[PDB]
Amino acid sequence: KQYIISEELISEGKWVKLEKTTYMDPTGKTRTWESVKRTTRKEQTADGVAVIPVLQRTLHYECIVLVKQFRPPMGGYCIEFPAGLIDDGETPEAAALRELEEETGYKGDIAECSPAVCMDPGLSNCTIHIVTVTINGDDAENARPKPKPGDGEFVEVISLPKNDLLQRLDALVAEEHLTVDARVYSYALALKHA
Amino acid sequence: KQYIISEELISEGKWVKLEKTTYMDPTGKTRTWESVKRTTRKQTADGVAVIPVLQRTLHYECIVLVKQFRPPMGGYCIEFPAGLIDDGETPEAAALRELEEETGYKGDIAECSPAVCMDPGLSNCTIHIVTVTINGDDAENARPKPKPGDGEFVEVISLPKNDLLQRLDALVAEEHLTVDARVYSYALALKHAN
């Protein structure tokens, strides 16, 4: 039933644009929406990746490796899956492994890769691949993980046991001002509900 | 260590605005970011998303999702039921209301997250994730009546919790839909649990 009639540009920055979207509703009435899009998406299957990094070590409970960063849109620190935009020509798996090493120091192994999933579909066209990666924490490569952050990237690594993820997140939120990402929270909640 | 210096309005629609954010990096170097915000925030958060666990005796437990045309995406998306919190609504109450409007199910609150971020690299948008049970054997939920607001056109898709990630992948394969990142992240963690 529904389709896009037109996309009018309102304002274009270096990274993000706003559009006036005109569409057909299922009654045959024409309507509008205000849409956010990134300016950086070329031939990539998605804007970005987020990495679910499962750190595995013998005689340790598995951990989910998270990162804490200052996020200017939010005006504060956020705890998220390691994540970044996919470079032109890069595969989602390659962007995931690259971002994970850059942000955390870990060299992971691909486990699975989602289709393009939407970040906030009521507002933006932004998509990511959610890529699950296992990190062999017994490998010497992963002993003293050294992050190699890019220009303007400032990251703290936080590894939390998978078996207690939601309580350990609540305990960090209780101790300082800091926002957990919706994807991390959704993942932690499902680990509880299962 | 990092903080916001100033925010310059670039462009303000009715629903969304685009700001140019100035901030201090950890080195004491001043930097800029392009930041999206909703204009509608009053609230604990902009919105709620509802994880609705449909429980019927002698049936698999289902997670209730919605499929809707999303103009920023130019297509159909599969999501948790969700909407903006009305000024002076609690998240709990917004959840049950949004669930009823979008699905017609009448639910009970199990738990409620703190405010979690949607896409903190781009926007300040936050939601409360609210886990709700639905006693699908109650007379009120027998023939549930979705009461949509203006400009909402919602198909309800109920999927078994125990096979959620495979069922979502099947839909995507056949139906050309985008699954929401929080739905996919929940579904993933249901598979990754112990």
Ligand SMILES: CC(C)N(C)c1ncnc2c1cnn2C
């Ligand atoms: C359906 C009604 C209440 N309108 C048009 C909207 N509701 C929520 N977010 C919106 C719009 C339009 N643009 N954006 C970003």
Ligand SMILES: CC(C)N(C)c1ncnc2c1cnn2C
């Ligand atoms: C060079 C990198 C770190 N910068 C500036 C950015 N990276 C990704 N998204 C961005 C920005 C700025 N605005 N927005 C929306």
Ligand SMILES: [Cl-]
């Ligand atoms: Cl539950």
Ligand SMILES: [Mg+2]
């Ligand atoms: Mg990143």
Ligand SMILES: [Mg+2]
């Ligand atoms: Mg990065």
Ligand SMILES: [Mg+2]
């Ligand atoms: Mg909604």
Ligand SMILES: [Mg+2]
């Ligand atoms: Mg609604």
